[PDB]
Structure 1
């Protein structure tokens, strides 16, 4: 706490629980002249505001670093992990040598149906993503998979296709900010 301003809710003269939308009550409410701390009643998702940016992303010579406004209201100890990879929970491992990688690559080309990504991962104690990064399958297998996917898509009704399109649009919208 750098600043010791008095803090205020966004105060109505009326009952806020019954008349939150009534602007008139807000207009009526006068408060004594001076500086206040009105903490925002909002998530800081779309905001480029300087009171919203974290201190690590502020520059070293920024005066705003010292001021207490990027408030750490939440606590990482209390919050549980969401869609977190197994590498993040128990650390990244760089154990597999070149020979092992070469063997994996050989296996994958030979028989991707038998030696699938998950199986490789299980064998070598490593991620399916990493297996993918390491090794391409036989392009034939990929083509087959694409054809299967196309067939599945064709098997849809009109409605399902539209829903999938909508989902895709939503996904695109998520990454806009």
Structure 2
């Protein structure tokens, strides 16, 4: 706490629980002249505001670093992990040498149906993503998979295709900010 301003809710003269939308009550409410701390009643998702940016992303010579406004209201100890990879929970491992990688690559080209990504991962104690990064399958297998996917898509009704399109649009919208 750098600043010791008095803090205020966004106060109505009326009952806020019954008349939150009534602007008139807000207009009526006068408060004594001076500086206040009105903490925002909002998530800081779309905001480029300087009171919203974290201190690590502020520059070293920024005066705003010292001021207490990027408030750490939440606590990482209390919050549980969401869609977190197994590498993040128990650390990244760089154990597999070149020979092992070469063997994996050989296996994958030979028989991707038998030696699938998940199986490789289980064998070598490593991620399916890493297996993918390491090794391409036989392009034939990929083509087959694409054809299967196309067949599945064709098997849809009109409605399902539209829903999938909507989902895709939503996904695109998520990454806009």
Q: Answer whether TM exceeds 0.5 for this pair.
A: yes
Please indicate the TM-score interval, normalised by the length of the shorter structure.
over 0.9
1:83 deviates by: 0.0
Q: Which residue of 1 aligns with 2:27?
A: 27
1:153 deviates by: 0.0
Query: Is 1:144–2:135 an aligned residue pair?
Result: no
1:40 aligned counterpart, secondary structure? coil
1:91 deviates by: 0.0
2:103 aligned counterpart, secondary structure? helix
2:70 aligned counterpart, secondary structure? coil
- Aligned mates of 1:172, 1:35 — CA distance in 2: 42
Q: Which residue of 2 aligns with 1:167?
A: 167
Give the TM-score taking structure 1 as reference length.
1.00
- Aligned mates of 1:102, 1:45 — CA distance in 2: 44
1:149 deviates by: 0.0
Q: Which residue of 2 aligns with 1:117?
A: 117
1:32 aligned counterpart, secondary structure? coil
Deviations 1:19-38 (A, max 9, x none): 00000000000000000000
| Structure 1 unpaired stretches of 5+ | none
1:90 deviates by: 0.0
Deviations 1:22-58 (A, max 9, x none): 0000000000000000000000000000000000000
Kindly report the root-mean-square deviation, in angstroms, between the aligned alpha carbons of the 2 structures.
0.0
Spell out structure 1 runs of 4+ moving beyond 3 A.
Answer: none
1:47 aligned counterpart, secondary structure? coil
Equivalences, count: 177
1:125 deviates by: 0.0
- Aligned mates of 1:15, 1:40 — CA distance in 2: 20
1:139 deviates by: 0.0
Q: Which residue of 2 aligns with 1:7?
A: 7
- Aligned mates of 1:40, 1:160 — CA distance in 2: 41
1:36 aligned counterpart, secondary structure? strand
**Structure 1 residues 18-167: aligned runs within 5 Å:** 18-167=18-167
- Aligned mates of 2:86, 2:10 — CA distance in 1: 43
Give the TM-score taking structure 2 as reference length.
1.00
